[PDB]
């Protein structure tokens, strides 16, 4: 019976809330009160990448920390040599409405997707000496929001149809599907071991999934609006989420509750991208107010501001070695900070 | 060794210039409408599991790209953000005096959306033929859904098309005013709304979009070239 099921769900929610409350003894702020502050950090633009004719959405750093891919609404995917600003490949897309891209860990394949509901896998190395579509992963019922490579043969993609799928590139058919969300999935991050991933779906909640069992392990709540950016902590035990309510939050899987909230009264705009430094001390968040802020992950204090961009910041990414951070924006410019 | 990288980068730049020209000379439009709106026929009028459709047509040597959202979810607040660089947004509303209030709400949301505060909206009042027969039938109880109609009179300077009865003119001008009040409610003037009356099968639709885009580009040029 519907009412009985709803009552049981409410009672179990109360039980879970009681477990959360009994599991908390002190806040991260109280424990870290003795940790010395990170202090003010000053970062200068080292590269300004030009050659895009439309607002940029997503960029991914390569495993070598040198090559990065970018996606713009003009229909071009450009692979930039960040060391010299040179362009290595320019891929004319079949659909100009791209919103996400991913660079394979081996670097042999690059993927993208958007409003077409199709993920296009582009092969960068071939005897023909040209870039061609290796496979198109059609089958989604909504716009693709995020794409990440688990392996050269497997890619996990998020869509606005409240569903996430693990695709097989060789056969082009879904291997597993995740359907526990109730809203548009915006971004997902892969754990360092690729054994787990988390995503936010415009329902003010973040959920943890298993790529083999195909089921949600944990559900995280506490946000007041749509979650736009999600990123794992470098150690893989915690993750940070950014939402439209102008606040970032840190969640730990083992504690299964919010640890810290990064809020400032001067911010009344949402967060577009969230990323962690290699050590995890610095939390970098992109904002709709034309600049990015760096937060002390432990002290929750604002350590610095990056205001080079003249438009909305769309994508933020940190190199695997943590040498530099590249911030994209709707001004059709990518700026690398160090 | 490294010189080949610069050579291929310059080749890429040269390839990018000759499609940058196309991108600059191209005009992009978004076709928004309800399920009952005759936007499907409007697309058919234009002539030279996918989530988005594209239509190619040109009037007076200028190329227009019109995008229609196909297999998509009704969570507009997220994917609508992409169409903030389109020259104009074509909004089609069905005269069903009541799905019209939902159309008003959608238009209001589009107008007040933060990232759509700079795009002119080309408003098409589609299916005027159905409205004419409905109002002439006497069962068009517009007053029940919109009480302001019982205390509204046609503007003195209104120009009615020949052969249209006063009742049809009053009803359709009230429908225009319902959108114009929302459009002017902002009072900022960054973007303009162009209300038009059109039918599902009409050849003048291409000219209307051409003129609206010309006006929008002229208004943009006034600001770009230090005139205002």
């Amino acid at each position: 019976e519907l009412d009985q099921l709803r009552q049981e769900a409410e009672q179990l929610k109360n039980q879970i809330r009681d477990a959360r409350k009994a599991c908390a003894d002190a806040t991260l702020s109280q424990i870290t009160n003795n940790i010395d502050p990170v202090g003010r950090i000053q970062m200068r633009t080292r590269r300004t990448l030009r050659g895009h004719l439309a607002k940029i959405y997503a960029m991914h750093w390569g495993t070598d920390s040198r090559l990065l891919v970018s996606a713009s609404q003009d229909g071009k995917l450009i692979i930039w040599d960040s060391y010299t600003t040179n362009k290595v490949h320019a891929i004319p897309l079949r659909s100009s409405w791209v919103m996400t891209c991913a660079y394979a860990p081996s670097g042999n394949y690059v993927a993208c997707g958007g409003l077409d509901n199709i993920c296009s896998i582009y092969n960068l190395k071939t005897r023909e000496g040209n870039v061609r579509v290796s496979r198109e992963l059609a089958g989604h019922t909504g716009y693709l929001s995020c794409c990440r490579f688990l392996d050269d043969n497997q890619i996990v993609t998020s869509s606005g149809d409240t569903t996430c799928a693990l695709w097989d590139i060789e056969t082009g058919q879904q291997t597993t599907t995740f359907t526990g969300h109730t809203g548009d999935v915006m971004s997902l991050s892969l754990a360092p071991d690729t054994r787990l991933f988390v995503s936010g779906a415009c329902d003010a909640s973040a959920k943890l999934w298993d790529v083999r069992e195909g089921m949600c392990r944990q559900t995280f709540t506490g946000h007041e609006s749509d979650i736009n950016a999600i990123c794992f902590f470098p150690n893989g035990n915690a993750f940070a989420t950014g939402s439209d309510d102008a606040t970032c939050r840190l969640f730990d899987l083992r504690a299964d509750q919010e640890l810290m909230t990064y809020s400032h009264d001067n911010i009344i705009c949402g967060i577009t991208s969230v990323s962690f430094s290699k050590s995890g001390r610095l939390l970098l968040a992109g904002y709709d107010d034309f600049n990015c802020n760096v937060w002390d992950a432990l002290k929750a204090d604002r350590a610095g501001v990056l205001a080079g961009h003249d438009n909305r910041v769309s994508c933020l990414g940190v190199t695997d070695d943590g040498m530099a951070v590249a911030t994209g924006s709707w001004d059709s410019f990518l700026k690398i900070w160090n | 060794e490294d010189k080949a990288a610069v050579e291929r980068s310059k080749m890429i730049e040269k390839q990018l210039q000759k499609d940058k020209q196309v991108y600059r000379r191209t005009l992009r439009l978004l076709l928004l409408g309800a399920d009952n709106s005759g936007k499907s026929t409007i697309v058919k009028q234009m002539r030279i599991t996918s989530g988005i459709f594209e239509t190619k047509f040109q009037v007076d040597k200028v190329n227009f790209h019109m995008f229609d959202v196909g297999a998509q979810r009704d969570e507009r607040r997220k994917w609508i953000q992409c169409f903030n660089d389109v020259t104009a947004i074509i909004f089609v509303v069905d005269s069903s005096d009541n799905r019209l209030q939902e159309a008003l709400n959608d238009f209001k949301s589009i107008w007040n959306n933060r990232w759509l505060r700079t795009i002119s909206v080309i408003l098409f009042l589609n299916k005027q033929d159905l409205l004419a027969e409905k109002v002439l039938a006497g069962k068009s109880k517009i007053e029940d859904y919109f009480p302001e109609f019982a205390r509204y009179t046609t503007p003195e300077d209104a120009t009615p098309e020949p052969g249209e009865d006063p009742r049809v003119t009053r009803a359709k001008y009230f429908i225009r005013k319902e959108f114009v009040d929302i459009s002017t409610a902002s009072g900022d003037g960054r973007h303009i709304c162009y209300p038009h009356f059109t039918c599902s099968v009409d050849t003048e639709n291409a000219r209307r979009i051409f003129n609206d885009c010309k006006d929008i580009i002229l208004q943009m040029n006034l600001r770009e070239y230090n005139l205002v």
Partner: nanobody, 128 residues
Framework: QVQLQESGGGLVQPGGSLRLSCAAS????????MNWVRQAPGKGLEWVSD????????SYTGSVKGRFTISRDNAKNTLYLQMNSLKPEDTAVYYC?????????????????????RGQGTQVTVSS
């Protein structure tokens, strides 16, 4: 967690009055624009009224203009909808909806496909 618990409803004779109240929790109520939505039997969701953060801007749908009044109490995170002169056509389940983001003017809460930021609603029946 963000939740909206509506209260009131029931059966009211035509021409009577009925007050609907919703308790808001899990978010900062004083920064989000609120809305009312109803779904009549065999009909899609219909927007009713809106109220800004401070209440200085209010709008109503034509069918209820002059009959329904919307008020909010930021001091106790409660939203009110005082209904008068009920009619048989008003029978429907009423939902309380919130804007997706704070400090925003436009809204897209009429979506039927599982809008996260609305409650389960309270049934209202107008009959003899």
């Amino acid at each position: 967690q963000v939740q909206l618990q509506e209260s009131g409803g029931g059966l009211v004779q035509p021409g009577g009055s009925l007050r609907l109240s919703c308790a808001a929790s899990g978010f900062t109520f004083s920064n989000y624009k609120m809305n009312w939505v109803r779904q009549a039997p065999g009909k899609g969701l219909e927007w009713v009224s809106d109220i800004s953060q401070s209440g200085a801007s209010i709008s109503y749908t034509g069918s209820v203009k002059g009959r329904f009044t919307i008020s909010r109490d930021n001091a106790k995170n409660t939203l009110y909808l005082q209904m008068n002169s009920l009619k048989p056509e008003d029978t429907a389940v009423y939902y309380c909806a919130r804007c997706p983001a704070p400090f925003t003017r436009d809204c897209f809460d009429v979506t039927s496909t599982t809008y996260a930021y609305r409650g389960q609603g309270t049934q209202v029946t107008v009959s003899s």
